Amino acid sequence: GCASDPRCRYRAR
């Protein structure tokens, strides 16, 4: 859900 979001705890991509 918040993978593309850098502010999220978990960062992907």
Q: How many helical (H) and strand (E) elements, i.e. helices and strands, does the chain have?
A: 0, 0
Are 12 and 3 in contact, with CB atoms under 8 Å apart?
yes
List of residues 6+ apart from 10 with CB closer than 8 A: 2, 3
List of residues 6+ apart from 2 with CB closer than 8 A: 8, 10
Experimental technique for the deposited model: NMR
Are 5 and 13 in contact, with CB atoms under 8 Å apart?
no
Q: Which residues of 1-13 are buried (b: 16+ CB within 10 A; e: fewer)?
A: eeeeeeeeeeeee
Cα–Cα distance for residue pair 11/1, rounded to 1 Å: 10
